[PDB]
Amino acid sequence: NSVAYSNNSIAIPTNFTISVTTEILPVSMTKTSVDCTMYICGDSTECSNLLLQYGSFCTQLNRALTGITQNVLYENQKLIANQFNSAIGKIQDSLSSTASALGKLQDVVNQNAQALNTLVKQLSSNFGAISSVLNDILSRLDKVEAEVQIDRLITGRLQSLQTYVTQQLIRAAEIRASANLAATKMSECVLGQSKRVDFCGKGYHLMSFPQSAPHGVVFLHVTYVPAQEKNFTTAPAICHDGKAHFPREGVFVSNGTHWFVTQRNFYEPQIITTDNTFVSGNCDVVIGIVNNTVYDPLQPELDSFKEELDKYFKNHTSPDVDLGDISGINQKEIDRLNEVAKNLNESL
Amino acid sequence: NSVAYSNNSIAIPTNFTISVTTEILPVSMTKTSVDCTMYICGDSTECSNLLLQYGSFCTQLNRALTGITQNVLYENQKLIANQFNSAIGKIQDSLSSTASALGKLQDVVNQNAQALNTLVKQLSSNFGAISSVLNDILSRLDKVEAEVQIDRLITGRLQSLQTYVTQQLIRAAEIRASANLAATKMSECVLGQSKRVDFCGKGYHLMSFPQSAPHGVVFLHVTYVPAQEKNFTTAPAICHDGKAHFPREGVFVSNGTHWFVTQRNFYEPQIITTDNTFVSGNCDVVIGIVNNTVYDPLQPELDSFKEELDKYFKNHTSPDVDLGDISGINQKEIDRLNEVAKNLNESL
Amino acid sequence: NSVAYSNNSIAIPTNFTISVTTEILPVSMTKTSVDCTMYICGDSTECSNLLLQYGSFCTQLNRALTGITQNVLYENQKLIANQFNSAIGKIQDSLSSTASALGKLQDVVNQNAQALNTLVKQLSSNFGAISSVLNDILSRLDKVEAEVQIDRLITGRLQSLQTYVTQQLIRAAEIRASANLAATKMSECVLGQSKRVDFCGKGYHLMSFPQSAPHGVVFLHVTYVPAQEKNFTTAPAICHDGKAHFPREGVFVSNGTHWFVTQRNFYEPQIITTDNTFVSGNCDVVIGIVNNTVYDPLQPELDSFKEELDKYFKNHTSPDVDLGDISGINQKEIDRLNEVAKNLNESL
Ligand SMILES: *[C@@H]1O[C@H](CO)[C@@H](O)[C@H](O)[C@H]1NC(C)=O
Ligand SMILES: *[C@@H]1O[C@H](CO)[C@@H](O)[C@H](O)[C@H]1NC(C)=O
Ligand SMILES: *[C@@H]1O[C@H](CO)[C@@H](O)[C@H](O)[C@H]1NC(C)=O
Ligand SMILES: *[C@@H]1O[C@H](CO)[C@@H](O)[C@H](O)[C@H]1NC(C)=O
């Protein structure tokens, strides 16, 4: 017998004051379209120019927000002439061979001088070619290493603009429920005298007069409130000798000695009769349970970043460049000939 | 005494026509799961292959959407022989030294020819090595400079798909409120005869019959509407000699000469009595104010992009490459020897 | 005459059991603020350090979530001496010219040896310079080609965190409607005895007692339910000789032989009278239609990726590097002089 037969002090309205309410309801959201350049980048021209390659995403966000003795002296004469004549013929061999040698040395040394001037003109081409191609690699790699950090910050400002767009769509879907509230609250109270307490102005309703506002309706409700209420002990029902008895359109207001079915909203007692009450059987309480569970979504739970990264990274290190190490490739006769050019006159 | 005692013409229902309403309510959203490749990239294979490195984000979005004288002639003979014998010994010195010199020149010139063929084989290695390593740097840098612009456009299409997912979750959270409206509107009108005007069909309610639809309920409401209404002047209350008097379940319909408490929803006058009215004291109006402020969120306001960028940029420019400038490193005797090889026979 | 005059079996309440309901309503959401590092990257330090360059986007998401014979022998003596004296003067020319030649060969060969040691010291500089500058280009390009795949996965985890933030704002905008439901459901039932069936506990309302819970209100409703109901055939209205007749606060309960206006919620018949019914004219049914179309947004439809890419791509291929092709730049007299240095003694 838990609570259905407990008696507790309940306030029941004892007189009235006449009153009026001004109640303001908004009935209509202006389309807060966003320029996506000025939001994300603003004045800063390098990121602005990057925004064009993010495509027409800005428009896409605005679709959302815009909606919503003579013999031996003579034989010595034969002898010395035969020694001389044979010597000079050996001088001509000695000298002709030296000319044929020194003329092959002067050939090959000038062919070497030609080869080195060929090498210098070709290597001037290589250090000139590498000057231009490697200056361009340097100048363009400096541009590309300036440009992946600005995209990083644009992409984190994209999320700030997507939080802007979400909170601006969220509010517009509350506004469209407040326009449904303005529809039911217009209908039931401008087209319809209510018997509900505090709907259509504080207290109890007499009459109303709507007036417009720029995006709203305002109601003048004429109503009466309780100027003066008393706590009567009560029960919702009473179980006499195993039968439960309970009101019809009232409560059991409790007098010191008797039960009366007062109207819930006023102290005006009337006697228990089979026309003021209903009746039951066996004196039992039915117990009901209601639990208004408002949706808890499937939130997007993820692996640790190491697992979702390692699924698809290559730690490729290019080798230390080694190339060819070219450091590993490593007068007396003219004095005499000048001396004997003089000292041969001592044998003239 | 603002509005509670003003009298204005109010329409009060004068006859009825019987009527029926067909009212359609949707009570149930099909799970619009999205393939994230086909949405963002479509057929285009280079961006498709990039999508795999964005991780399983697609699934994460689908968790959401799937939820929700003889002596001097002889001394001259001694003399000339002594001059000749001494001269030839000086010829052998002159010639042996020239051979030892010209044999050191032919040694060193062929050691130079060896060194230059060593240099050409090592430099053929360097321009062949740099050919391959620098072609790869060129060929791969062209690939990497093709691949940061396609990620830009994928990342702006991600926001278009996140606006898709947000508007598809927003609608599903309206659908779940329309399924709560279908619960109260089923209960109060299929299980319960309403005393409300225009709830359960135009006019006043008699009876109803629900019928299903594929994702909805449809009600046949049987109701009566006012076929024919008259404007009576009225007041919500009247203050006689400093006491306010007001109805009980009606309005003061105003006849040319008397006040009657008509029922709000019909013209049927009844006389003012203490059983048709309540009464007050001192003739004052209570004024109430209600302002139904619907949530305005903390929207994500940001610095200018220059401040949020400059927090974390280095304008490093690599110097213009300069390297070594190798352009800054800059027969008559054989004719005679051929001539005296002939002209020495003139002294044979 | 479609449905307004059809008669069908309707259940009308025949006794009561007293009952109590416990009804639980949540009235208040704890601020689930998110550390954005631990959500997206977690422990993994390389992506963590990247998060700083995405800016204070994390804060921006937390603004949202924290809200919400002697002569001829002598003439031969003159002759041979004149031949010898003239020959030696031609030897001095032959030898002085050879010295002046061989001294220009020994000059130019050592000037060549100087030029090649100059070349090797300058080229040691070039292969040393290119060693350092090209090792840095290799070492830094390896760093930059490691650093665009981790940003890809951060940017797809950003969308997972933006789905988290959207579903956490969506739920908080349902919570703020459930706090409006707790306001009306507190007011009409703690401050006000309802005449509605199943609002304020199963059945019909007597009385109630609210009790708090940590984020909720719980109502004890005392109510009566129907312990025991009978199907009477009925019509909502009847059209006698071309006039439609219909109840006032009841239904036409159908007895075997007569029509009675029973109260909708109880079987208790009363006779048709002009005080139990309203009356009409011409016997016609008005037909009304109501179609409660719940917002279907402008969803962000996009071109194919090829069109939105091609608006802003350059397929620049750098040419195959060609450079200078240096492979296209391509003892007997000392034996004799050693032989005649010996064989000239045969003419001493
Ligand atoms: C209800 O109140 C009356 C007096 O007001 C008292 O006599 C009675 O015992 C109370 N009911 C219960 C169950 O105590
Ligand atoms: C309450 O109303 C009654 C009924 O007329 C009246 O007699 C009584 O004086 C009123 N109370 C006050 C405080 O005015
Ligand atoms: C309504 O029911 C009665 C008997 O209950 C029957 O005589 C009458 O014909 C029914 N109405 C119609 C239109 O059939
Ligand atoms: C229903 O109520 C009546 C009225 O007192 C009673 O006579 C009847 O026995 C009750 N029915 C049951 C099954 O108790």
Three-class SS state of C291: strand
Q: Using the atom order of ligand 1, give the atom closest to the CA of residue A255.
A: 5
Three-class SS state of C253: strand
Q: Which of A253, A254, A283 to mutate to test the pocket of ligand 1 (most atoms within 8 A of CB)?
A: A254
With beta carbons less than 8 A apart as the criterion, state whether C291 and C50 touch.
Answer: no
Lookup: tokens for A338:
């000048």
Three-state SS annotation for chain B: CCCCCCCEEEEECCCEEEEEEEEEEECCCCCCCCCHHHHHCCCCHHHHHHHHHHCCHHHHHHHHHHCCCHHHHHHHHHHHHHHHHHHHHHHHHHHHHHHHHHHHHHHHHHHHHHHHHHHHHHHHHHHHHHHHHHHHHHHHHHHHHHCCCHHHHHHHHHHHHHHHHHHHHHHHHHHHHHHHHHHHHHHHHHCCCCCCCCCCCCCEEEEEEEEEECCEEEEEEEEEEECCCEEEEEECCEEECCEEEEECCCEEEECCCCEEEECCCCCCCCECCCCCEEECCCCCCEEEEEECCCCCCCCCCCCCHHHHHHCCCCCCCCCCCCCCCHHHCCCHHHHHHHHHHHHCHHHC
Residue A219 lies in a domain: no
Rounded CA separation A173/A239 (Å): 51
Amino acid letter at B222?
V
* Cα first-last separation, chain C: 164
With beta carbons less than 8 A apart as the criterion, state whether B263 and B249 touch.
Answer: yes
Q: For residue C236, which of C2, C4, C1, C74 has the smallest C-alpha distance? A: C4
Length of chain C: 348
Q: For residue A54, which of C155, B311, C234 has the smallest C-alpha distance? A: C155
Residue A338, CA distances (Å) to A192, B132, B200, C100 in order: 142, 57, 139, 9
* Cα first-last separation, chain B: 164
Residue B100, CA distances (Å) to B103, C21, C175 in order: 5, 131, 111
Rounded CA separation B132/C323 (Å): 12
Q: Which residues pair with B234 in a beta bridge?
A: B8, B253
The answer for residues whose C-beta is within 8 angstroms of residue C247's C-beta and 6 or more apart is B206, C237, C261, C276, C277, C278
Lookup: tokens for B286:
């209570």
With beta carbons less than 8 A apart as the criterion, state whether B269 and B260 touch.
Answer: yes
Residue A242 lies in a domain: yes
With beta carbons less than 8 A apart as the criterion, state whether A65 and A32 touch.
Answer: yes
User: Which residue has the CA at smallest separation from atom 1 of ligand 1?
Assistant: A7
Q: Collect all residues of chain B within an 8 Å Cβ-Cβ radius of residue C61.
A: 300
Three-class SS state of C21: strand
Lookup: tokens for C17:
């059991």
With beta carbons less than 8 A apart as the criterion, state whether C60 and A163 touch.
Answer: yes
Indicate if the alpha-carbon torsion angle A125, A127, A130, A135 is positive or negative. negative
Residue C294 lies in a domain: yes
CA angle A113-A115-A118, nearest 5°? Answer: 110
Residue B119, CA distances (Å) to A114, A124, B133, B266, C145 in order: 16, 17, 21, 120, 36
Residue A21 lies in a domain: no
Distance from CA of B232 to the nearest CA of C (A): 22
Q: Using the atom order of ligand 2, give the atom closest to the CA of residue A228.
A: 13
User: Which residue has the CA at smallest separation from atom 11 of ligand 1?
Assistant: A7
Report the greatest alpha carbon distance in chain A: 202
**Is the CB of C233 inside a 6 Å radius of any atom of ligand 3?**
yes
With beta carbons less than 8 A apart as the criterion, state whether A254 and A270 touch.
Answer: no
Q: Which residue, chain included where needed, has tokens 């278009």? A: B160
Residue C196, CA distances (Å) to B15, B204, B334, C176 in order: 27, 16, 137, 25
**Four-point Cα dihedral A115, A119, A122, A127, nearest 10:** -170
**Is the CB of C7 inside a 6 Å radius of any atom of ligand 3?**
yes
User: Which residue has the CA at smallest separation from atom 8 of ligand 3?
Assistant: C7
Query: Within 10 A of C171 (CB to CB), how many other CB atoms are there?
Result: 19
* Cα first-last separation, chain A: 164
Look at C148 and B150 and tell me if their CB atoms are within 8 Å.
Answer: no
Three-class SS state of C42: coil
Rounded CA separation C109/B52 (Å): 68
| Pairing of the two strands A8-12 and C238-240 | unpaired
Solving technique: cryo-EM
With beta carbons less than 8 A apart as the criterion, state whether B338 and A93 touch.
Answer: no
With beta carbons less than 8 A apart as the criterion, state whether B95 and C340 touch.
Answer: yes
Three-class SS state of C286: strand
Rounded CA separation C199/B177 (Å): 18
Lookup: tokens for C92:
């001095």
Rounded CA separation B257/A25 (Å): 38
With beta carbons less than 8 A apart as the criterion, state whether B236 and A206 touch.
Answer: yes
Same domain for A256 and A147:
no
Report resolution in angstroms: 3.5
Query: Within 10 A of A196 (CB to CB), how many other CB atoms are there?
Result: 15
**Is the CB of A278 inside a 6 Å radius of any atom of ligand 4?**
no
Q: Which residue, chain included where needed, has tokens 């940061």? A: B148
Q: For residue C253, which of C239, C274, C279, C272 has the smallest C-alpha distance? A: C272
Length of chain A: 348
Contacts for C263-270: CB closer than 8 Å, 24+ residues apart: C264/B193, C264/C12, C265/B193, C265/C12, C265/C13, C265/C197, C265/C204, C266/C12, C266/C13, C267/C12, C267/C13, C267/C14, C267/C230, C267/C232
**Is the CB of A281 inside a 6 Å radius of any atom of ligand 4?**
yes
DSSP 8-state secondary structure symbol assigned to residue C163: H
What is the domain extent for residue A96?
A: 29-194
Rounded CA separation B12/B21 (Å): 23
Q: Which residue, chain included where needed, has tokens 């008005």? A: C286
Residue B300 lies in a domain: yes
Look at B63 and A135 and tell me if their CB atoms are within 8 Å.
Answer: no
Same domain for A63 and A146:
yes
How many Cα atoms occupy the beta-carbon half-sphere of B251 within 13 Å?
30
User: What is the full DSSP assignment across C80-114?
Assistant: HHHHHHHHHHHHHHHHHHHHHHHHHHHHHHHHHHH
With beta carbons less than 8 A apart as the criterion, state whether C120 and A329 touch.
Answer: yes
**Residue of C163, C168, C251, C265 to mutate, testing the B interface (most B Cβ within 10 Å of its Cβ):** C163
Rounded CA separation B285/B2 (Å): 8
Query: Within 10 A of C110 (CB to CB), how many other CB atoms are there?
Result: 12
Q: Which residue, chain included where needed, has tokens 């963002």? A: B40
Residue B216, CA distances (Å) to B21, B200, C137 in order: 16, 16, 68
Ligand closest to Cα of A255 equals 1
Q: Which residue, chain included where needed, has tokens 């217009």? A: A186
Rounded CA separation C324/C327 (Å): 9
Q: Which residues pair with C245 in a beta bridge?
A: C238, C279
Same domain for A267 and A141:
no
Look at C158 and A157 and tell me if their CB atoms are within 8 Å.
Answer: no
Phi, psi (5° rounding) for residue A196?
-85, 150
Touching A (3+ Cβ pairs <8 A), the chains are: B, C
DSSP H or E stretch at residue C285 = none
Lookup: tokens for A134:
């490697």
Sheet of B243-247: strands edge to edge?
B238-240, B243-247, B277-279
Q: Which residue, chain included where needed, has tokens 């800016």? A: C55
Q: Collect all residues of chain A within an 8 Å Cβ-Cβ radius of residue C41.
A: 305
Rounded CA separation C287/B260 (Å): 35
Contacts for C284-287: CB closer than 8 Å, 24+ residues apart: C284/B17, C284/B18, C285/B18, C285/B19, C285/B20, C285/C1, C285/C2, C285/C4, C286/B17, C286/B18, C286/B19, C286/B20, C286/B202, C286/B225, C287/B19, C287/B20, C287/B22, C287/C2
**Residue of A334, A336, A339 to mutate, testing the C interface (most C Cβ within 10 Å of its Cβ):** A334
Q: Using the atom order of ligand 4, give the atom closest to the CA of residue A281.
A: 14
Rounded CA separation C332/A337 (Å): 22
Count B/C contacts: CB-CB distance under 8 Å.
332
Three-state SS annotation for chain A: CCCCCCCEEEEECCCEEEEEEEEEEECCCCCCCCCHHHHHCCCCHHHHHHHHHHCCHHHHHHHHHHCCCHHHHHHHHHHHHHHHHHHHHHHHHHHHHHHHHHHHHHHHHHHHHHHHHHHHHHHHHHHHHHHHHHHHHHHHHHHHHHCCCHHHHHHHHHHHHHHHHHHHHHHHHHHHHHHHHHHHHHHHHHCCCCCCCCCCCCCEEEEEEEEEECCEEEEEEEEEEECCCEEEEEECCEEECCEEEEECCCEEEECCCCEEEECCCCCCCCECCCCCEEECCCCCCEEEEEECCCCCCCCCCCCCHHHHHHCCCCCCCCCCCCCCCHHHCCCHHHHHHHHHHHHCHHHC
Phi, psi (5° rounding) for residue A210?
-80, 145
The answer for residues whose C-beta is within 8 angstroms of residue A237's C-beta and 6 or more apart is A4, A5, A244, A245, A246, A247, A252, C18, C206, C222, C224
DSSP 8-state secondary structure symbol assigned to residue C53: G
| Pairing of the two strands B16-26 and C286-291 | parallel
Distance from CA of C53 to the nearest CA of A (A): 6
Distance from CA of B348 to the nearest CA of A (A): 5
Lookup: tokens for C317:
């291929």
For chain B, the domain total comes to 1
Rounded CA separation C19/C201 (Å): 9
Look at C4 and B17 and tell me if their CB atoms are within 8 Å.
Answer: no
Residue B129 lies in a domain: no
Q: Collect all residues of chain A within an 8 Å Cβ-Cβ radius of residue C299.
A: 63
The residue out of A143, A176, A194 marking a domain boundary is A194
User: Which residue has the CA at smallest separation from atom 10 of ligand 2?
Assistant: A15
Amino acid letter at C271?
I
With beta carbons less than 8 A apart as the criterion, state whether A10 and A247 touch.
Answer: no
Q: For residue C301, which of A28, B42, B78, B136 has the smallest C-alpha distance? A: B42
User: Which residue has the CA at smallest separation from atom 13 of ligand 2?
Assistant: A228
Same domain for A287 and A171:
no
With beta carbons less than 8 A apart as the criterion, state whether B57 and C160 touch.
Answer: yes
The answer for residues whose C-beta is within 8 angstroms of residue A82's C-beta and 6 or more apart is none
Query: Within 10 A of B138 (CB to CB), how many other CB atoms are there?
Result: 16
Q: Collect all residues of chain A within an 8 Å Cβ-Cβ radius of residue C206.
A: 236-237, 246-247, 251
DSSP H or E stretch at residue C216 = strand C216-226
Lookup: tokens for A194:
């209510």
Q: Using the atom order of ligand 1, give the atom closest to the CA of residue A5.
A: 13
With beta carbons less than 8 A apart as the criterion, state whether B250 and B262 touch.
Answer: yes
Q: For residue A47, which of A178, A166, A147 has the smallest C-alpha distance? A: A147
Distance from CA of B237 to the nearest CA of C (A): 23
Q: Collect all residues of chain A within an 8 Å Cβ-Cβ radius of residue B164.
A: none
Sheet of A251-254: strands edge to edge?
A8-12, A230-235, A251-254, A259-262
Lookup: tokens for B68:
């929700």
Rounded CA separation A36/A61 (Å): 9
Amino acid letter at B203?
G
Lookup: tokens for B51:
């999508």
Same domain for A241 and A159:
no
Q: Is B37 left (phi over 0), alpha (psi -120 to 50) or beta?
A: alpha
Amino acid letter at B171?
R
Q: How far is the CA of A11 from the centre of ligand 2 (A)?
A: 18
Q: For residue A326, which of C201, B70, C118 has the smallest C-alpha distance? A: C118
Rounded CA separation C282/B228 (Å): 14
Residue A322 lies in a domain: no
With beta carbons less than 8 A apart as the criterion, state whether B239 and B283 touch.
Answer: yes
DSSP H or E stretch at residue C203 = none
Rounded CA separation A241/A225 (Å): 41
Rounded CA separation B225/C246 (Å): 12
Query: Within 10 A of A200 (CB to CB), how many other CB atoms are there?
Result: 25
C-alpha of A299 from chain center: 18
**Is the CB of A17 inside a 6 Å radius of any atom of ligand 2?**
no
With beta carbons less than 8 A apart as the criterion, state whether B10 and B231 touch.
Answer: yes
Distance from CA of C251 to the nearest CA of A (A): 20
With beta carbons less than 8 A apart as the criterion, state whether A252 and A260 touch.
Answer: yes
**Is the CB of B281 inside a 6 Å radius of any atom of ligand 2?**
yes
Same domain for A134 and A187:
yes
Residue C221, CA distances (Å) to A164, A278, C25 in order: 44, 18, 13
**Residue of C152, C296, C325 to mutate, testing the B interface (most B Cβ within 10 Å of its Cβ):** C152
How many Cα atoms occupy the beta-carbon half-sphere of A321 within 13 Å?
21
Q: For residue C40, which of C147, C162, C170 has the smallest C-alpha distance? A: C162
Q: For residue C130, which of A134, B139, B136, B142 has the smallest C-alpha distance? A: A134
Rounded CA separation C195/A95 (Å): 146
Q: How far is the CA of C231 from the centre of ligand 3 (A)?
A: 14
Rounded CA separation B196/C140 (Å): 78
Residue A231 lies in a domain: no
